[PDB]
């Protein structure tokens, strides 16, 4: 089910990288966030 | 380099339908404006934050 | 319960604060104008409202007829007066004044 | 925090033709 | 305010009268141009977007030309003086209920089958005189009529002191009988008001009325207690809401017939008539007859407005400039 | 107030915008008179004599162009003093001046009190002569309004 | 705003099915479920 | 003549006889038709996203 | 007794559509305006001359 | 006193009204009083900064602001945008009776 | 920043940050809704057919 | 136009000063009211439909209040002095095509990528001096950039005689070669021009430009021809249109959010500012904080506009009405 | 001035007509507060006649 256009999306990917996917916080009381090592 | 962004909206814009007198557009990433047919306002804000 | 009474006094006993130029007159805490609309009793009191000092059937009958002489057919002239408790005994003792004459 | 319960609601009552509502109010409730 | 036409009608506001084509610089300028043979008349005017011309009047094909002043277009507000009837009783009889019925004829519609009635009621006392009756009647009238929660102001109520006899003492819903201190009142004037207005959407219309009475039993006989006659009008409605309505119609014979309708996608016509000034109106009416077989006439007209302050100084100069160029004999107002 | 408020039904809207609807009125009009003039232009006063005596023409100034050529219009007293309009409306600013004459065989004319400001004038018909006549009368149109409300 | 699911099948088009996925990507990471805990609470236990 | 509420925009209007286009335009029965398929996108070479 | 009527319309009112900003009314015989959904202008001229 | 939708003050001997409630006097619905801010407690009294709500460009009469006039809570309106907290909730307490054998 | 045709009465508009309802009205995206089921006839006893 | 706000902005036009709530009689007046305890400031302005007060500023919670003149709200129209590079050639060479490209950068969009390129060209001949060149190029640009067919006014181009050196002789597409009669021309000035403006639909904006020159062969090497230096501006666009578009925006906070959307059904809010007058602007930017744990502030601002008569008379008298009443030091401008 | 610049910006680069564009919004690593905002747009329309 993947169009030939959609194969070129997979085939145009820069390279590789490799549990810190990315963090959301809802109901934040405040704006003051502290991070430089990678955790907030 | 550490970067940051922020947008603030009023609370009444949760389900705020757009009675489009002029057609409501989204800015493309390419610089172009593209005409859109969606009518809710927060669909257009959340485009521009990303 | 006391927010039910907020929506029962805003629906019924509320008022409007706009101009004839569309401007609002009152501003809230955050600068924006507190927008209010008229309730039941400030919209229904723009027409057919009379202020009496003593109730009489000379006044109510001749105001309900002239409303019904120009607007209502002869079969469709039923008016259900809604009033309080003591307004029922003021309508009792005034028809009895009319009937005894 | 303080423990505040906030509640909010919108409303509105439309009277279409106010010529079809008649009222006799006593004179002490005016002005 | 939609009006009726014979055929097409064009209005040009005359804000300043110049004498040359090259001097037309300010928006509202006009120069009545003609030939030296006096066979063609037209009006070069300055629009807000350049100089425009009028239609070329053939001066043999003019039908009538008259100029209307500002005080002829002033609507005289009608008044009704309510007194006690002398034949019934000059003094209010005790214990009888004096109820007045104001009978309106055009309440929200365009027709009299849409009526409306507002009342006022007074029971008299044993020591109530005539002047104390009109004090309590007009307070009871203004409590019903001129409330702050009403839709439109319908009538204004005014008493007359018998010693002054020329000054209206106004009563509102906030007026108390403590403030009405005169001991000689002889009539209650009920006077209609100026209805609201926005140009093009709401015309300048009025709601007429008649004060009617109910019956009282004075000596066992059912008599209506008062008489209500129509006195001469004392106030006038100014001309400004009629001419700014009149330009809004005749700026569609020249320019856009679509005013505002698809709202961001419009042509916006800018009008040069201020609605806060009275105007003197000149309507020169003329036609066109074809060459051989087109003898049927195209009866059109050209309207010109000019503001006056007191004496008509601007329109009498415009009639003097049309006369000295075209050669007509339009009467000077 | 729950027994009072729930006696009324409810209505559902899409959003918190102010809402409007259609308002329909009525059509049957009669035009009030502004002033009446004799044939020389002098306005008839309240204490003047009879106007239009011997079926002499006179003018009739209305605030709108409503009646047409050859039409019979009547004052406050309908069918007693019928006026026949002799031509189109001559505009006086916004006013409409019809040169009228009577249509009832009336030799003494109309009184001056029945020609004052505030008299209602309706249309009756537009009669002609049975041969060689030309066109008379016209037709009229109206429009509705609207009203809003708030939240 | 989740699109209306009270439609006939002809009005469940290519853009309607795509609008359901752009909602799940964008809005919901909500983690408000009545009987199950929060993702940072389980991850500590792991 | 008058108003049904504090906020009533229009008044009842009337005319007689010959109806022209401004007679039909001032009673709000004449509107421009939106050309839907006609659409002008401004010509540019867009160097965003590059 | 004999009577007569006349009414002149413009030439372009053959198939003149009404765009209905306010809903077009039609004056009935009883003196009551009724809402009419007919879009042409000649549907309201042919009723009024009748 | 409220001649141009101008503030004034109302002193009540109990703290019974709230931050943004619209209260009315002996004449309901004609003189709506929107409370501006909390009450400053002058000992046992409490003074509320108060402006007029329902379109009053003339102000209340001075006779309608005398000692003894009872006031009642209607509701607490806000605007549509960026609104903040207004209003409060009131309660009541029971008293006991007694008998012996 | 000028005009491309003669009747380009609209200009390109832009703002930043918090958008109120007023920013949504100045760009012509808010219109009053029409309650179409709401239709009123002004009450009278018409006697035109009488 | 549409502007950004710090969570609200509301504008009040200060057309006249009355200093008391009983004298507010005509439209557009202002009274800055405050009590004797310096804690509350509000502005009672007489709107066209009644007396309307402002948000009650708590004077311990103001942030900044600075008043700006009308010479700081005028966009200066920049100039560009197009000349021959005398190091290249003192006199024009008799063979080459002298072409000048104007690079417009915001033609119908907002972005620098909506460009427009307009040109003018002279074929220079033998014996053609520099003043005959500048006479022959200002016509070759006025046929292009100041023609009557163009959609928008792009630039205003001029010529300068070396004897006068301060006044400009303007060249238009209709200007013939015999109109410019001077043997001492030395530069060509290309100036920005005022674009159109519509109240609320089309804001005030400007189309910028850079004169760029094309290469000619001098000796055997293709060199640039001209030099273009930015001359200090002389013409400034006034403050009438930036304040009308600011009032039209800020009336919608206290009023209808839609402005004309749906035109049988609009609320005509009357606007008081004149677009043909220059205005001073004073902004009082404040906030709100309650005496509780809700210590976050809700920023607000109030804009007061008043007419300038050249010496800032109405605004400095308005500031003196605020400083004595409220006890802030708004600086007189 | 970022970039470690100590001697300042030359005054001939702060003149009228100097164009300023948005690069990014760098924040401190510990205890940052909210920066940045979000920018919107709206189009125009044209017209023709017969």
């Amino acid at each position: 089910v993947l169009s030939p256009k959609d194969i070129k999306y997979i085939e145009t990917m820069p390279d590789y990288i490799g549990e810190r996917y990315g963090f959301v916080n809802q109901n934040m009381i405040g704006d003051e966030i502290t991070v430089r090592d990678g955790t907030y | 380099t550490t970067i940051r962004i922020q947008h603030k909206v009023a609370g009444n814009k949760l389900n705020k339908k757009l009675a489009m007198g002029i057609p409501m557009v989204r800015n493309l990433e390419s610089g172009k404006q593209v005409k859109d047919t969606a009518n809710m306002w927060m669909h257009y804000v959340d485009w521009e934050v990303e | 319960l006391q927010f039910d009474e907020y929506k029962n006094n805003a629906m019924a006993w509320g008022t409007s604060n706009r101009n004839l130029n569309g401007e609002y007159m009152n501003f809230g805490k955050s600068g924006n104008a507190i927008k209010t609309g008229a309730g039941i009793f400030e919209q229904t009191e723009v027409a057919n409202t009379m202020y009496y000092n003593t109730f009489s059937l000379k006044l109510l009958e001749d105001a309900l007829y002239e409303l019904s002489a120009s607007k209502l057919a002869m079969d469709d002239r039923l008016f259900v007066i809604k009033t309080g408790e003591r307004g029922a005994i003021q309508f009792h003792k005034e028809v009895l004044k009319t009937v005894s004459g | 925090g303080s423990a505040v319960i906030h509640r909010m609601a919108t409303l509105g009552v439309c009277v279409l033709d106010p010529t079809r509502t008649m009222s006799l109010i006593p004179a002490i409730l005016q002005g | 305010m939609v009006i009726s036409i014979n055929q097409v009608r064009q209005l040009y506001v005359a804000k300043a009268l110049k004498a040359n084509t090259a001097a037309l610089t300010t928006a509202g300028d006009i120069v009545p141009k003609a030939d030296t043979a006096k066979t063609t008349l037209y009006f070069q005017s300055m629009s807000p977007a350049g100089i425009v011309a009028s239609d070329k009047i053939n001066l043999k094909h003019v039908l009538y030309a008259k100029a209307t002043p500002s005080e002829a277009l002033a609507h005289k507000l009608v008044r009704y003086s309510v007194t006690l009837d002398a034949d019934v009783s000059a003094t209010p009889v005790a214990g009888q209920n004096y109820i007045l019925r104001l009978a309106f004829r055009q309440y929200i519609g365009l027709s009299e089958e849409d009526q409306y009635f507002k009342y006022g009621e007074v029971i008299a006392r044993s020591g109530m005189t005539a002047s104390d009756f009109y004090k309590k009647m007009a307070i009871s009238l203004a409590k019903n009529l001129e409330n702050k929660t009403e839709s439109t102001p319908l009538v204004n109520i005014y008493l007359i002191s018998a010693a002054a006899a020329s000054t209206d003492v106004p009563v509102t819903s906030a007026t108390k009988e403590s403030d009405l201190t005169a001991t000689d009142y002889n009539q209650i004037i009920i006077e209609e008001t100026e209805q609201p207005w926005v140009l093009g959407m709401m015309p300048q219309a009025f709601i007429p009325f008649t004060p009617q009475f109910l019956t009282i039993t004075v000596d066992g006989e059912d008599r209506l207690w008062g008489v209500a006659t129509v006195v001469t009008p004392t106030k006038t409605v100014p001309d400004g809401h009629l001419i700014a309505d009149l330009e809004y119609f005749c700026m569609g014979a020249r320019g856009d017939i679509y005013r505002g309708m698809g709202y961001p996608n419009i042509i916006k016509t800018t009008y040069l008539v201020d609605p806060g000034a009275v105007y003197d109106v000149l309507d020169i009416h003329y036609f066109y007859t074809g060459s051989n077989e087109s003898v049927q006439k195209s009866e059109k007209t050209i309207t010109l407005v000019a503001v006056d302050d007191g004496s008509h100084t601007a329109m009498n100069a415009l009639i003097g400039a049309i006369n000295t160029a075209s050669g007509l004999t339009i009467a000077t107002l | 107030l729950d027994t009072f408020l729930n006696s009324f039904p409810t209505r559902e809207f899409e959003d918190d915008n102010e809402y409007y609807w259609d308002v329909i009125g009525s059509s049957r009009r009669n035009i009030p008179l502004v002033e009446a003039r004799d044939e020389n232009g002098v306005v008839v006063a309240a204490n003047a004599a009879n106007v239009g005596v011997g079926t002499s023409p006179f003018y009739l100034v209305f605030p709108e162009d409503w009646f047409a050529d050859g039409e019979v219009i009547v004052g406050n007293l309908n069918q007693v003093y019928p006026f026949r309009i002799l031509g189109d409306a001559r505009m006086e600013g916004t006013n409409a001046v019809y040169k009228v004459e009577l249509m009832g065989g009336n030799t003494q004319g109309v009184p001056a009190e029945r020609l004052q400001q505030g008299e209602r004038f309706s249309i009756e018909f537009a009669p002609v002569e049975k041969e060689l006549s030309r066109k008379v009368g016209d037709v009229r149109f109206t429009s509705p309004v609207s009203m809003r409300n708030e939240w | 705003n989740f699109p209306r699911q009270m439609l006939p099948f002809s009005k469940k088009t290519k853009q309607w099915r795509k609008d359901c996925l752009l909602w799940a990507n964008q809005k919901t990471f909500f983690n408000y479920s009545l009987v199950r805990k929060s993702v940072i609470h389980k991850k500590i236990n792991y | 003549a008058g108003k049904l509420g504090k906020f009533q925009m229009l008044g009842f209007q009337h005319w007689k006889g010959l109806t022209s286009d401004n007679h039909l335009g001032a009673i709000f029965q004449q509107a421009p038709q939106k050309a839907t398929n006609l659409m002008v996108q401004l010509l540019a070479f867009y160097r965003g996203k590059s």
Side-chain angles (χ1 to χ4, degrees), chain F residues 45-146:
Chain F
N47 264 27
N50 267 265
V51 198
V53 307
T55 322
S56 69
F58 64 99
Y59 299 93
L60 211 62
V61 183
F62 286 96
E64 296 157 0
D65 201 345
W66 192 251
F67 321 123
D69 184 24
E71 272 182 340
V72 183
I73 47 157
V74 283
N76 259 347
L77 280 180
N78 44 359
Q79 86 177 354
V80 169
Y81 308 104
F83 314 96
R84 185 205 153 202
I85 296 145
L86 306 156
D88 304 67
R90 282 171 149 256
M91 281 295 118
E92 275 182 23
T94 321
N95 292 345
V97 178
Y98 310 94
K99 188 175 59 173
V100 311
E101 66 168 19
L102 284 161
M103 203 67 210
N106 216 346
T107 79
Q108 63 250 15
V110 54
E113 43 184 301
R114 301 292 95 189
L115 277 191
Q116 289 290 141
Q117 177 172 358
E119 188 153 278
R120 307 190 258 150
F121 270 75
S122 274
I123 324 163
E124 295 208 336
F125 37 78
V128 289
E129 57 267 45
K130 315 164 83 43
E131 60 269 14
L132 271 80
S133 159
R134 294 153 88 108
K135 59 167 174 74
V136 293
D138 216 317
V139 76
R140 295 132 202 99
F141 316 98
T142 51
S143 45
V145 293
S146 176

Side-chain angles (χ1 to χ4, degrees), chain E:
Chain E
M1 187 199 57
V2 180
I3 63 162
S4 192
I5 52 158
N6 36 62
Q7 280 190 5
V8 77
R9 161 173 210 162
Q10 321 280 359
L11 198 143
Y12 304 104
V13 49
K15 255 181 168 151
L17 175 49
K18 325 287 272 204
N20 184 220
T21 299
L24 293 143
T25 76
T26 82
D29 268 9
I30 192 162
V31 183
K33 299 289 295 307
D35 308 0
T36 59
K38 306 188 197 331
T39 187
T40 318
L41 177 64
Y42 59 97
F43 290 96
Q44 292 173 354
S45 176
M46 172 74 173
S47 87
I51 171 175
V52 304
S54 68
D55 188 48
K56 276 80 192 170
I57 304 171
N58 200 356
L59 288 167
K60 188 204 137 191
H61 287 144
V62 72
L63 281 177
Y64 73 96
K66 71 186 308 306
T68 319
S70 75
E71 78 272 25
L73 299 168
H75 186 254
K76 303 175 188 177
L77 293 175
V78 307
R79 313 171 74 92
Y80 272 89
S81 88
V82 189
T83 64
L84 264 190
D85 204 358
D87 52 51
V88 175
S89 278
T91 291
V93 306
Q96 288 307 308
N97 198 358
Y98 281 70
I99 300 167
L100 180 138
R101 175 182 41 230
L102 279 149
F104 304 102
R105 276 180 285 96
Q106 320 182 12
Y107 189 56
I108 282 144
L110 233 29
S111 100
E112 282 71 2
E113 290 157 353
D114 308 338
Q115 274 158 335
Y116 188 56
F117 303 95
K118 292 297 264 189
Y119 287 78
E121 56 97 23
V122 168
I123 44 179
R125 311 299 184 187
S126 45
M128 172 169 291
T129 184
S131 67
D132 209 5
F133 170 61
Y134 302 142
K135 214 209 300 183
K136 292 185 183 292
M137 191 89 223
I139 286 307
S140 158
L141 275 172
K143 269 178 180 33
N144 306 324
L145 294 150
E146 279 291 323
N147 286 315
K148 76 154 207 191
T149 175
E150 297 307 328
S151 65
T152 171
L154 297 162
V155 288
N156 288 124
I157 312 285
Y158 301 110
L159 288 84
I160 296 298
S161 162
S166 158
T167 55
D168 301 0
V169 181
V171 280
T172 329
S173 164
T175 316
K176 199 51 170 82
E177 82 249 9
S178 157
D179 274 317
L180 296 158
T181 176
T183 174
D184 47 4
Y185 291 130
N186 42 24
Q187 45 196 310
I188 299 169
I189 295 177
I190 312 171
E191 177 211 51
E192 77 187 25
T193 74
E194 203 156 302
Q195 291 298 311
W197 176 92
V198 62
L199 75 162
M201 303 203 297
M202 195 187 297
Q204 180 184 282
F206 294 94
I207 167 168
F209 69 104
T210 314
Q212 298 175 318
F213 314 103
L214 306 194
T215 71
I216 61 162
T217 81
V218 44
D219 278 31
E221 318 192 65
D222 293 307
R223 318 273 307 275
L224 54 90
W225 53 265
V227 64
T229 177
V230 48
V231 306
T232 177
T234 65
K235 268 163 193 85
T236 56
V237 172
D239 203 6
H241 299 315
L242 275 172
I243 306 302
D245 260 323
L246 191 59
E247 194 193 10
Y248 189 92
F249 198 80
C250 317
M251 280 317 287
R254 280 200 282 169
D256 53 318
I257 55 170
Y258 312 105
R259 308 167 193 85
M261 255 314 286
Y263 169 68
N265 303 315
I266 61 178
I267 308 302
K268 186 179 286 185
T269 319
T270 76
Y271 310 110
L272 307 171
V273 166
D274 216 336
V278 304
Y279 272 95
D280 312 318
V281 194
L282 162 64
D283 174 89
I284 184 163
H285 180 68
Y286 66 106
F287 62 96
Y288 166 70
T289 297
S291 67
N292 298 359
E293 71 272 353
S294 316
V295 192
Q296 296 92 14
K297 315 177 188 313
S298 298
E299 325 279 1
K300 70 188 86 71
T301 197
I302 290 180
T303 311
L304 290 95
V305 300
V307 50
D308 53 3
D309 298 352
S311 158
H312 320 267
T313 179
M315 176 50 73
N316 303 332
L318 191 54
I319 296 151
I322 288 156
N323 279 257
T324 197
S326 85
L328 305 185
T329 316
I330 304 174
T332 292
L333 49 82

Side-chain angles (χ1 to χ4, degrees), chain D residues 4-18:
Chain D
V4 190
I5 169 66
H6 303 262
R7 306 214 40 197
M8 184 196 285
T10 191
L11 54 93
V13 170
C14 199
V15 173
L16 302 184
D17 297 345

Side-chain angles (χ1 to χ4, degrees), chain C residues 2-98:
Chain C
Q2 300 165 247
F3 190 61
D4 189 14
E5 196 70 37
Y6 276 19
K7 311 193 298 179
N8 290 346
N9 293 326
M11 272 172 164
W13 285 51
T15 186
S16 52
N17 58 344
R18 283 189 82 182
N19 272 327
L20 310 183
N21 219 15
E23 275 154 292
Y24 300 88
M25 289 188 221
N26 294 269
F27 304 108
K29 304 182 170 190
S30 50
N32 278 308
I34 294 180
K35 311 190 200 292
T36 56
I40 312 189
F41 284 94
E42 296 317 282
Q43 287 181 69
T44 71
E45 278 172 22
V46 309
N48 291 331
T49 289
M50 326 283 157
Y51 287 93
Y52 71 100
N53 52 39
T54 70
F55 177 52
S56 42
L57 267 299
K58 184 135 75 150
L59 177 61
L60 176 66
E61 180 218 0
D62 288 327
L64 284 186
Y65 178 67
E66 296 272 357
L67 198 165
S68 65
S70 187
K71 308 170 79 221
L72 301 189
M74 292 185 66
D75 41 17
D76 192 67
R77 271 174 193 190
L78 196 63
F79 297 123
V80 176
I81 303 275
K82 274 277 190 312
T83 181
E85 191 193 0
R86 324 264 179 153
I89 82 179
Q90 196 202 46
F91 185 73
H92 163 66
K93 293 187 300 180
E94 190 88 10
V95 176
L96 167 146
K97 174 204 210 153
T98 294

